[PDB]
Amino acid sequence: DTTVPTFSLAELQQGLHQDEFRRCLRDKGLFYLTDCGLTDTELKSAKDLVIDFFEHGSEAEKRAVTSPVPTMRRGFTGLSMCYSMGTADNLFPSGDFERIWTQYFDRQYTASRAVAREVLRATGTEPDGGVEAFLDCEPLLRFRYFAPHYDLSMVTLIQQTLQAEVGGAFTDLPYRPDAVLVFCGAIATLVTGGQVKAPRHHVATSSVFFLRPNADFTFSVPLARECGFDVSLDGETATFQDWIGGNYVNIRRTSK
Amino acid sequence: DTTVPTFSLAELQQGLHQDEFRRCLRDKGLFYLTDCGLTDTELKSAKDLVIDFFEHGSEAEKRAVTSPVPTMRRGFTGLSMCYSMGTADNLFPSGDFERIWTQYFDRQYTASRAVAREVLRATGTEPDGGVEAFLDCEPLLRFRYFAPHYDLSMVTLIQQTLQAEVGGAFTDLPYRPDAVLVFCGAIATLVTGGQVKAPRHHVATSSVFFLRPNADFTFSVPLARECGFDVSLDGETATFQDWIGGNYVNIRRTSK
Amino acid sequence: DTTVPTFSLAELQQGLHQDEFRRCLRDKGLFYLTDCGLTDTELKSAKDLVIDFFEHGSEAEKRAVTSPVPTMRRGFTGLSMCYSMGTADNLFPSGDFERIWTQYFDRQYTASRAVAREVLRATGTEPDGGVEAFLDCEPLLRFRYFAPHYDLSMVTLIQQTLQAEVGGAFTDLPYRPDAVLVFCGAIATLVTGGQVKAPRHHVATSSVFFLRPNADFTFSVPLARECGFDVSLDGETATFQDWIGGNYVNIRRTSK
Ligand SMILES: CC1=C(C(=O)O)N2C(=O)[C@@H](NC(=O)CCC[C@@H](N)C(=O)O)[C@H]2SC1
Ligand SMILES: CC1=C(C(=O)O)N2C(=O)[C@@H](NC(=O)CCC[C@@H](N)C(=O)O)[C@H]2SC1
Ligand SMILES: CC1=C(C(=O)O)N2C(=O)[C@@H](NC(=O)CCC[C@@H](N)C(=O)O)[C@H]2SC1
Ligand SMILES: [Fe+2]
Ligand SMILES: [Fe+2]
Ligand SMILES: [Fe+2]
């Protein structure tokens, strides 16, 4: 009914709880994940450090880590405030920032890839071009400081020190110790041929890690149509780029 | 001034009221349509049946007709609730559902094509690739249960058991017996070289049938620019896909 | 800190105040501009004339200058009301309208190109395909009569008879005599490799002139990524069209 399991990554990789995992994937498309290299500690360390910067970083040094266009892709954004990162072109205040945040990013990127790898394994999915080339992709990490959507990611990881639709009701998703919250996104549904649900969710700090596909991730157009994707795509295969266009879009509303 | 005519499809096909029809097309881009194979009865039959499902369908069987991504393209969506259909990949609770709804869909798809065929005939329009290949397209039917936009369809049919702009005022569009409401959309304007208005409208159950072009519907870029389309398209011809991108977009707001 | 300079175009072209201009570009991305062929008078003349049309133009003649799709690209739109223009396919009530407005448009298009030419010169930027082919582009003028965004233009010129972010605070931008307000847009940032800021701004009549790139404006994908553009573009170069798609988009919000 409206419950959300915890899975241990380690157990999934050993091949335990495979029916339960497949059933969670198909019916809910969200779960908590443990034993994935993330603690709860390290969050603290990255959090306090960037929070000090938000609170006590000088306006002059905020400038040095602000992109010239206000996209929230890298560095600082003031609207509430955000700090964003990916695998390259980062903007680090540094001294020690780069160290703590490169580590926090990398562990989340490892955890995201390894859980996506298990989603693919559990569903018998081989992406066009292979699993590895699919998962060596374009992640985006956003950390922010102070309307229902689904994600266009493969998975999205959300760390806590939030509500989602489960079984037809929007439910709260409280903290579970040393567990991260995983939302499957629309690329999971797409890549698996419909075996994975992309749940709606929304709010009511935050750390959100999107495991986003490469521009050239390629999929079958008829199979996309079958899963519920309302594609306007001529011909039999397409890319991520063809579908979403030339700028990443991270989330989507159900049409009004 | 601010009146909306009824046309009989049958009369338009006989070549009656052709100046009146052309003038409605160009100045208003909306009308009621009779004698098009739709009753008022059959609405009831599809309505009551899906409404029973909305009201009394079990959460477990709603799951079997819910797409894994919440696009409202096929099957059930809960936000108020929706049931969607097209020509293929449907999700039917069935027993008799599939029968009543396949019929309700088909008659609306027939009525939409036949009225679009008369829009094209009245305006002297031959789409690139022919009329038939244009009208053998990608319709979408949405039925829902409990801000002004124009439609990006060829026509949109709306059945009643609503306000639009006519002559510079937003007016009510009450029911007329055994008539369906037709809104011309932006593909009508585009395909006809500007001979058809795409009116703005909005709300204040619902059945909406969008007659949407194929991804490969091809048109002239300079002629599009002339009709008011603010295209960013290099070269002399383009497709629907090139214009709108790789996911259908059904409605649009005037830029804020 | 939070001040906005006036530059004289004439002085910039003579090579004066070049460090100050570069520093304004990089840190603020907005300024007032004088000595650019715009007065304050001519505004009046175009304003009063179109305002008379808004107030006293007959509904029948508003129809003759209304596009069949309500895009606000050319002619009249009623929502408050708008009058739009570009280099071709205009809709003029005329008698003398076309004269006053063709002049008001042309002087703004001259001023926009000449200031963009100085942005490019100041930053040592040679666009792929040359400066001239870049600036011979697709401008759009909107004049209207009675949420923070950045512009996707090269520059946007705004005439006054408004708030923006400067140094981390949203500030008012009062009138300065015989000066026009210039906002640099995201194409300035993109084309210059990040040397120009695209500031956020918003409201709280209006004349807005967008100097928009051609569909085929071509840029480097890795350099775009470096400047903060969250592109989903395979391969090493791309066009405006590839990035934004097949319909112009003039403004953008920072992701929510
Ligand atoms: C007839 C009509 C009405 C109406 O309210 O009556 N409008 C509605 O209620 C709308 N029908 C829809 O579901 C619009 C959502 C499509 C949107 N997700 C997109 O992809 O662009 C419009 S479409 C035409
Ligand atoms: C100068 C300025 C202002 C302003 O309010 O002053 N902002 C405005 O009022 C805006 N001008 C517009 O018409 C924006 C709508 C474009 C939008 N439909 C899209 O396609 O993306 C902006 S553009 C720059
Ligand atoms: C986990 C989660 C949450 C959440 O609130 O917790 N939602 C958020 O707060 C969202 N994270 C974002 O920054 C969304 C903005 C992306 C948007 N500009 C676009 O390009 O499409 C979502 S993404 C998943
Ligand atoms: Fe989300
Ligand atoms: Fe509509
Ligand atoms: Fe703007």
PDB file of C-alpha atoms in Angstrom, chain C residues 92-230:
ATOM      1  CA  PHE C  92       0.926  49.009 -39.817  1.00  0.00           C
ATOM      2  CA  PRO C  93      -2.367  50.863 -39.412  1.00  0.00           C
ATOM      3  CA  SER C  94      -0.500  53.537 -41.440  1.00  0.00           C
ATOM      4  CA  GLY C  95      -1.216  56.797 -42.975  1.00  0.00           C
ATOM      5  CA  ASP C  96       1.723  58.070 -40.904  1.00  0.00           C
ATOM      6  CA  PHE C  97       2.154  55.189 -38.459  1.00  0.00           C
ATOM      7  CA  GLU C  98       4.503  53.235 -40.669  1.00  0.00           C
ATOM      8  CA  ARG C  99       6.670  56.322 -41.013  1.00  0.00           C
ATOM      9  CA  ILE C 100       6.998  57.153 -37.354  1.00  0.00           C
ATOM     10  CA  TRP C 101       7.358  53.494 -36.269  1.00  0.00           C
ATOM     11  CA  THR C 102       9.754  52.381 -39.063  1.00  0.00           C
ATOM     12  CA  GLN C 103      11.971  55.287 -37.920  1.00  0.00           C
ATOM     13  CA  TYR C 104      11.642  54.466 -34.206  1.00  0.00           C
ATOM     14  CA  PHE C 105      12.440  50.815 -34.978  1.00  0.00           C
ATOM     15  CA  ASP C 106      15.402  51.611 -37.233  1.00  0.00           C
ATOM     16  CA  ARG C 107      17.085  53.961 -34.737  1.00  0.00           C
ATOM     17  CA  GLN C 108      16.741  51.348 -32.020  1.00  0.00           C
ATOM     18  CA  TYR C 109      18.069  48.680 -34.291  1.00  0.00           C
ATOM     19  CA  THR C 110      21.071  50.907 -35.205  1.00  0.00           C
ATOM     20  CA  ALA C 111      21.710  51.716 -31.516  1.00  0.00           C
ATOM     21  CA  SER C 112      21.448  47.996 -30.536  1.00  0.00           C
ATOM     22  CA  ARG C 113      23.836  46.860 -33.261  1.00  0.00           C
ATOM     23  CA  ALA C 114      26.345  49.618 -32.532  1.00  0.00           C
ATOM     24  CA  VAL C 115      26.414  48.952 -28.824  1.00  0.00           C
ATOM     25  CA  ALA C 116      26.681  45.180 -29.409  1.00  0.00           C
ATOM     26  CA  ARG C 117      29.550  45.888 -31.772  1.00  0.00           C
ATOM     27  CA  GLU C 118      31.277  47.718 -28.915  1.00  0.00           C
ATOM     28  CA  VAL C 119      30.595  44.819 -26.469  1.00  0.00           C
ATOM     29  CA  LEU C 120      32.284  42.469 -28.926  1.00  0.00           C
ATOM     30  CA  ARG C 121      35.203  44.908 -29.503  1.00  0.00           C
ATOM     31  CA  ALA C 122      35.742  45.543 -25.823  1.00  0.00           C
ATOM     32  CA  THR C 123      35.905  41.806 -25.097  1.00  0.00           C
ATOM     33  CA  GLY C 124      38.047  40.845 -28.061  1.00  0.00           C
ATOM     34  CA  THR C 125      35.275  38.740 -29.481  1.00  0.00           C
ATOM     35  CA  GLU C 126      35.023  37.606 -33.032  1.00  0.00           C
ATOM     36  CA  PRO C 127      31.812  35.517 -33.422  1.00  0.00           C
ATOM     37  CA  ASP C 128      32.047  32.354 -35.600  1.00  0.00           C
ATOM     38  CA  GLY C 129      31.154  33.734 -39.032  1.00  0.00           C
ATOM     39  CA  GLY C 130      32.146  37.330 -38.250  1.00  0.00           C
ATOM     40  CA  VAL C 131      30.747  40.289 -36.368  1.00  0.00           C
ATOM     41  CA  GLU C 132      28.567  41.526 -39.161  1.00  0.00           C
ATOM     42  CA  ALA C 133      26.758  38.364 -39.907  1.00  0.00           C
ATOM     43  CA  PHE C 134      26.163  38.015 -36.165  1.00  0.00           C
ATOM     44  CA  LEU C 135      24.571  41.531 -35.868  1.00  0.00           C
ATOM     45  CA  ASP C 136      22.530  41.318 -39.022  1.00  0.00           C
ATOM     46  CA  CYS C 137      20.050  39.325 -37.051  1.00  0.00           C
ATOM     47  CA  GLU C 138      16.425  38.957 -35.839  1.00  0.00           C
ATOM     48  CA  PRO C 139      15.397  41.829 -33.600  1.00  0.00           C
ATOM     49  CA  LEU C 140      12.008  42.152 -32.024  1.00  0.00           C
ATOM     50  CA  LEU C 141      10.433  45.365 -30.706  1.00  0.00           C
ATOM     51  CA  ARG C 142       7.516  45.229 -28.302  1.00  0.00           C
ATOM     52  CA  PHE C 143       5.610  48.291 -26.956  1.00  0.00           C
ATOM     53  CA  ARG C 144       3.001  47.660 -24.333  1.00  0.00           C
ATOM     54  CA  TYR C 145       0.204  49.887 -22.876  1.00  0.00           C
ATOM     55  CA  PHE C 146      -2.010  49.794 -19.782  1.00  0.00           C
ATOM     56  CA  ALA C 147       9.214  37.360 -11.413  1.00  0.00           C
ATOM     57  CA  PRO C 148      12.932  37.832 -12.097  1.00  0.00           C
ATOM     58  CA  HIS C 149      14.215  36.776 -15.540  1.00  0.00           C
ATOM     59  CA  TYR C 150      17.275  37.146 -17.690  1.00  0.00           C
ATOM     60  CA  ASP C 151      17.152  37.842 -21.391  1.00  0.00           C
ATOM     61  CA  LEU C 152      18.264  35.399 -24.156  1.00  0.00           C
ATOM     62  CA  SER C 153      19.239  38.311 -26.379  1.00  0.00           C
ATOM     63  CA  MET C 154      22.608  39.739 -27.239  1.00  0.00           C
ATOM     64  CA  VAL C 155      21.394  43.071 -25.654  1.00  0.00           C
ATOM     65  CA  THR C 156      17.996  44.338 -24.863  1.00  0.00           C
ATOM     66  CA  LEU C 157      17.307  48.117 -25.075  1.00  0.00           C
ATOM     67  CA  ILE C 158      14.528  49.632 -22.935  1.00  0.00           C
ATOM     68  CA  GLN C 159      13.388  53.243 -23.453  1.00  0.00           C
ATOM     69  CA  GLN C 160      11.739  55.320 -20.716  1.00  0.00           C
ATOM     70  CA  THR C 161       9.513  58.424 -20.472  1.00  0.00           C
ATOM     71  CA  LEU C 162      11.975  48.496 -13.282  1.00  0.00           C
ATOM     72  CA  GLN C 163      14.402  46.624 -11.060  1.00  0.00           C
ATOM     73  CA  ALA C 164      17.572  44.623 -11.658  1.00  0.00           C
ATOM     74  CA  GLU C 165      20.105  42.684  -9.758  1.00  0.00           C
ATOM     75  CA  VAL C 166      23.267  44.634  -9.199  1.00  0.00           C
ATOM     76  CA  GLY C 167      25.889  43.521  -6.700  1.00  0.00           C
ATOM     77  CA  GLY C 168      23.508  41.010  -5.025  1.00  0.00           C
ATOM     78  CA  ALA C 169      20.594  43.366  -4.469  1.00  0.00           C
ATOM     79  CA  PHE C 170      17.651  44.157  -6.694  1.00  0.00           C
ATOM     80  CA  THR C 171      17.773  47.863  -7.323  1.00  0.00           C
ATOM     81  CA  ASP C 172      15.734  50.474  -9.037  1.00  0.00           C
ATOM     82  CA  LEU C 173      16.647  51.777 -12.423  1.00  0.00           C
ATOM     83  CA  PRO C 174      15.262  55.241 -12.694  1.00  0.00           C
ATOM     84  CA  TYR C 175      15.123  57.324 -15.875  1.00  0.00           C
ATOM     85  CA  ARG C 176      18.193  59.212 -17.008  1.00  0.00           C
ATOM     86  CA  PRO C 177      17.643  61.883 -19.602  1.00  0.00           C
ATOM     87  CA  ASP C 178      18.365  61.005 -23.204  1.00  0.00           C
ATOM     88  CA  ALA C 179      19.764  57.697 -22.124  1.00  0.00           C
ATOM     89  CA  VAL C 180      18.509  54.273 -22.922  1.00  0.00           C
ATOM     90  CA  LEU C 181      18.720  51.327 -20.528  1.00  0.00           C
ATOM     91  CA  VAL C 182      20.750  48.333 -21.899  1.00  0.00           C
ATOM     92  CA  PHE C 183      20.532  44.808 -20.348  1.00  0.00           C
ATOM     93  CA  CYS C 184      23.061  42.380 -21.672  1.00  0.00           C
ATOM     94  CA  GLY C 185      21.542  39.013 -22.361  1.00  0.00           C
ATOM     95  CA  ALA C 186      22.687  35.348 -22.301  1.00  0.00           C
ATOM     96  CA  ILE C 187      23.893  35.538 -25.977  1.00  0.00           C
ATOM     97  CA  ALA C 188      26.350  38.192 -24.886  1.00  0.00           C
ATOM     98  CA  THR C 189      27.664  35.865 -22.200  1.00  0.00           C
ATOM     99  CA  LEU C 190      27.729  32.963 -24.629  1.00  0.00           C
ATOM    100  CA  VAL C 191      29.384  34.715 -27.623  1.00  0.00           C
ATOM    101  CA  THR C 192      32.067  36.362 -25.412  1.00  0.00           C
ATOM    102  CA  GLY C 193      33.016  33.183 -23.566  1.00  0.00           C
ATOM    103  CA  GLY C 194      31.701  34.410 -20.277  1.00  0.00           C
ATOM    104  CA  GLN C 195      33.038  37.976 -20.291  1.00  0.00           C
ATOM    105  CA  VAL C 196      29.592  39.487 -19.992  1.00  0.00           C
ATOM    106  CA  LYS C 197      27.003  39.034 -17.251  1.00  0.00           C
ATOM    107  CA  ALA C 198      23.360  38.482 -18.015  1.00  0.00           C
ATOM    108  CA  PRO C 199      21.575  40.166 -15.112  1.00  0.00           C
ATOM    109  CA  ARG C 200      18.213  39.252 -13.727  1.00  0.00           C
ATOM    110  CA  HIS C 201      15.482  41.879 -13.729  1.00  0.00           C
ATOM    111  CA  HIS C 202      11.740  42.511 -13.799  1.00  0.00           C
ATOM    112  CA  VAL C 203       8.973  45.130 -13.496  1.00  0.00           C
ATOM    113  CA  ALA C 204       7.748  47.097 -10.395  1.00  0.00           C
ATOM    114  CA  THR C 205       3.866  52.050 -21.156  1.00  0.00           C
ATOM    115  CA  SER C 206       7.015  49.961 -21.830  1.00  0.00           C
ATOM    116  CA  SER C 207       9.314  49.793 -24.836  1.00  0.00           C
ATOM    117  CA  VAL C 208      11.577  46.731 -25.159  1.00  0.00           C
ATOM    118  CA  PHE C 209      13.907  46.006 -28.030  1.00  0.00           C
ATOM    119  CA  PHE C 210      15.506  42.562 -28.220  1.00  0.00           C
ATOM    120  CA  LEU C 211      18.625  42.125 -30.414  1.00  0.00           C
ATOM    121  CA  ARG C 212      18.189  38.324 -30.996  1.00  0.00           C
ATOM    122  CA  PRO C 213      20.666  36.109 -32.866  1.00  0.00           C
ATOM    123  CA  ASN C 214      19.926  34.304 -36.146  1.00  0.00           C
ATOM    124  CA  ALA C 215      18.846  30.637 -35.987  1.00  0.00           C
ATOM    125  CA  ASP C 216      22.233  29.772 -37.345  1.00  0.00           C
ATOM    126  CA  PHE C 217      24.435  31.620 -34.929  1.00  0.00           C
ATOM    127  CA  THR C 218      27.085  29.053 -34.154  1.00  0.00           C
ATOM    128  CA  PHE C 219      29.113  28.635 -30.945  1.00  0.00           C
ATOM    129  CA  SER C 220      31.460  26.242 -29.185  1.00  0.00           C
ATOM    130  CA  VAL C 221      29.736  23.628 -26.950  1.00  0.00           C
ATOM    131  CA  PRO C 222      32.628  23.187 -24.431  1.00  0.00           C
ATOM    132  CA  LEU C 223      33.071  26.907 -24.122  1.00  0.00           C
ATOM    133  CA  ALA C 224      29.280  27.265 -23.503  1.00  0.00           C
ATOM    134  CA  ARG C 225      29.518  24.667 -20.674  1.00  0.00           C
ATOM    135  CA  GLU C 226      32.383  26.617 -19.148  1.00  0.00           C
ATOM    136  CA  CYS C 227      30.313  29.905 -18.961  1.00  0.00           C
ATOM    137  CA  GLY C 228      27.550  28.022 -17.010  1.00  0.00           C
ATOM    138  CA  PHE C 229      25.226  26.967 -19.871  1.00  0.00           C
ATOM    139  CA  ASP C 230      23.603  23.683 -18.963  1.00  0.00           C
TER     140      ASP C 230
END
